[PDB]
Design an enzyme around this catalytic site. Sequence first.
Site, PDB file in Angstrom:
ATOM      1  N   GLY A 174      69.537 -12.373  43.507  1.00 57.98           N
ATOM      2  CA  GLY A 174      68.944 -13.721  43.652  1.00 57.98           C
ATOM      3  C   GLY A 174      69.509 -14.735  42.648  1.00 57.98           C
ATOM      4  O   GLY A 174      69.226 -15.950  42.827  1.00 57.98           O
ATOM      5  N   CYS A 229      72.702 -15.490  42.197  1.00 52.73           N
ATOM      6  CA  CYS A 229      73.846 -16.136  42.886  1.00 52.73           C
ATOM      7  C   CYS A 229      73.507 -17.607  43.143  1.00 52.73           C
ATOM      8  O   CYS A 229      72.374 -17.907  43.556  1.00 52.73           O
ATOM      9  CB  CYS A 229      74.216 -15.432  44.189  1.00 52.73           C
ATOM     10  SG  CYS A 229      74.687 -13.693  43.972  1.00 52.73           S
ATOM     11  N   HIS A 250      78.352 -16.579  50.847  1.00 52.82           N
ATOM     12  CA  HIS A 250      77.829 -15.230  51.167  1.00 52.82           C
ATOM     13  C   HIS A 250      76.324 -15.293  51.491  1.00 52.82           C
ATOM     14  O   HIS A 250      75.796 -14.260  51.926  1.00 52.82           O
ATOM     15  CB  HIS A 250      78.244 -14.202  50.106  1.00 52.82           C
ATOM     16  CG  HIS A 250      77.503 -14.225  48.814  1.00 52.82           C
ATOM     17  ND1 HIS A 250      78.160 -14.315  47.603  1.00 52.82           N
ATOM     18  CD2 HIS A 250      76.194 -14.091  48.524  1.00 52.82           C
ATOM     19  CE1 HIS A 250      77.282 -14.253  46.622  1.00 52.82           C
ATOM     20  NE2 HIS A 250      76.061 -14.141  47.157  1.00 52.82           N
TER      21      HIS A 250
HETATM   22  C1  LIG Z   1      76.894  -8.058  47.816  1.00 46.03           C
HETATM   23  N1  LIG Z   1      78.082  -8.855  47.600  1.00 46.03           N
HETATM   24  C2  LIG Z   1      77.951 -10.277  47.740  1.00 46.03           C
HETATM   25  C3  LIG Z   1      79.169 -11.119  47.431  1.00 46.03           C
HETATM   26  C4  LIG Z   1      80.490 -10.371  47.413  1.00 46.03           C
HETATM   27  C5  LIG Z   1      80.362  -9.022  46.645  1.00 46.03           C
HETATM   28  C6  LIG Z   1      81.427  -8.546  45.851  1.00 46.03           C
HETATM   29  C7  LIG Z   1      81.293  -7.339  45.164  1.00 46.03           C
HETATM   30  C8  LIG Z   1      80.081  -6.622  45.282  1.00 46.03           C
HETATM   31  S1  LIG Z   1      79.854  -5.055  44.426  1.00 46.03           S
HETATM   32  N2  LIG Z   1      81.332  -4.525  43.755  1.00 46.03           N
HETATM   33  O1  LIG Z   1      78.776  -5.161  43.431  1.00 46.03           O
HETATM   34  O2  LIG Z   1      79.281  -4.110  45.387  1.00 46.03           O
HETATM   35  C9  LIG Z   1      79.023  -7.087  46.065  1.00 46.03           C
HETATM   36  C10 LIG Z   1      79.161  -8.309  46.758  1.00 46.03           C
END
Ligand SMILES: CN1CCCc2ccc(S(N)(=O)=O)cc21
Lengths: 304, 304
Positions: free
Chosen positions: A143, A145, A41
């Site tokens: 950050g 991740c 991602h």
């Molecule tokens: C922003 N992003 C990156 C990776 C995949 C993912 C999955 C869930 C969510 S969530 N439920 O916090 O918006 C956000 C997200």
Amino acid sequence: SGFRKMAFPSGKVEGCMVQVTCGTTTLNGLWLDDVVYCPRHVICTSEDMLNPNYEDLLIRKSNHNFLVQAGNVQLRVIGHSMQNCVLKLKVDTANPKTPKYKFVRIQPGQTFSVLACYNGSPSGVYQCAMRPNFTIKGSFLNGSCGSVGFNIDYDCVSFCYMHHMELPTGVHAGTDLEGNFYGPFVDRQTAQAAGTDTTITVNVLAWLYAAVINGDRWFLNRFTTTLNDFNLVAMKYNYEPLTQDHVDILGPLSAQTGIAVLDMCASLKELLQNGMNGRTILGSALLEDEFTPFDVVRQCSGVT
Amino acid sequence: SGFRKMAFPSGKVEGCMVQVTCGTTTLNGLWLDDVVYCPRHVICTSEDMLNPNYEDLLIRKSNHNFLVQAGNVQLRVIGHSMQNCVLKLKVDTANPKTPKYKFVRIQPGQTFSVLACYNGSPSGVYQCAMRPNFTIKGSFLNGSCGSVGFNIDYDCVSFCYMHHMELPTGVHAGTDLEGNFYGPFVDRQTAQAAGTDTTITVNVLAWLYAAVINGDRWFLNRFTTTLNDFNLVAMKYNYEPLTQDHVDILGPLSAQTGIAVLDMCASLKELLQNGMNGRTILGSALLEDEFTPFDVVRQCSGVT
Ligand SMILES: CN1CCCc2ccc(S(N)(=O)=O)cc21
Ligand SMILES: CN1CCCc2ccc(S(N)(=O)=O)cc21
């Protein structure tokens, strides 16, 4: 004496953490040999994050679009590939601080240490369990991740977790280092629910053994019970069913304490049916389940 | 999101840990520049431990009686001295892994990370508070002595604690790195009692702020109170008196959450007078006091 939610020393992992930037997005990567591993991602814009086609997105990206910085020195990217939900960035330099390591996919109920990182910089270390529903109850901000979970066996780091996202419930979902999610989670910004989170029965029993060892014995009772009787009570309280495998894994603690597993199960039964009556065990007012039998033996014996 | 008892990454300290052996006794030392620091009780035999004359004991000892091993390599000892309850062993090699560091004597209620070690080898890391009664609730076995407590400010390790002993109550007593005990403890095998251990009020309030930030707000009530009224209730429950210094230190959290310190004090009051009614806050069934206001800001902002 004493008992603490203890993490592995994080030095061998601190030497592996890098910053990965693609377009505007920065997160953490793991530099082992000449490969940097990060969440895929990294290649997504906040508008891609809703329904990303990672294959189509990655096609727009070249080796030079991946900025990999180790402390203050930049790494040259000579290759990129997607394996499941991780990107592998081939760099032209082997990390000189690469520990002996393995990639391991852990089982729910098993524990590991998390080195939380921001911009490839370590901020802190805590001990976690993979919940039965394949979430972790972490401490992760924007950050974080690419922050990894690990165990250490003497000189060997077993990497088991890479942080990918927080679910709308504030629990954490991630992958093994082959980029396969723990649980049913996908790397897409959509409503994703975790199952019912059960309590890790074998871990609670392990912790009851840790408590007796450390002088907290008030909860020891005159009763015993049976696997089937105990599991009737486990069912009611959303505890994981106890099997003979669990009993076997508790045998060393059984042996040291001279308290038969099924007697400790009867202690636990009474605790579930009666609560703690405002008492504490190892400075805790609830039943702790993020120590494995292995963790109790390690901590209570002194394994380095 | 999420909140965890988080330790500093321990790598910079892992590079500093050595094994120190004098006669039959082995424990841990801290190698910074060309000086190894360890507990002076290293020079004691189990029969000396009852009423040791450290001056008379040390007189029997020469540079070569102090065996200092770093991993598998031996260090040459060219000088020895006693400062308070620590021995300083001058070695002929500067530790090449010496981080930027300081010795700091911490205040009760302040928190630090402990790298528990055996035979100069790190086994684990956890976060601790100096109890108001100058004990710590640690996890320390035989050979853990010389294990150090520390904080990290970006690149600088502030060493605040060296582990010396477990009291018959199973709490832990130790020194700063100038070898002055925290509290009234002496390095002698005799019955030593710690004072009444109070709860670190400013830390509990900090943690209540962490909870609100992370979505756990059930305990927020319609009431407020006064410093004097709050401290009447603190007195009753063996909480530390809250001063305006504490209120000032909570101001950033007050500001972020828009919840006035004295309103949070009223939340805490109700919690003390009424208990948690089987509810939990940040997965805890009691009031946590081993997070400083600084710890909450750090964790809840993402300081590396
Ligand atoms: C922003 N992003 C990156 C990776 C995949 C993912 C999955 C869930 C969510 S969530 N439920 O916090 O918006 C956000 C997200
Ligand atoms: C063995 N030794 C080493 C350092 C000083 C000291 C103080 C108290 C105790 S205690 N109360 O565990 O026996 C033991 C001890």
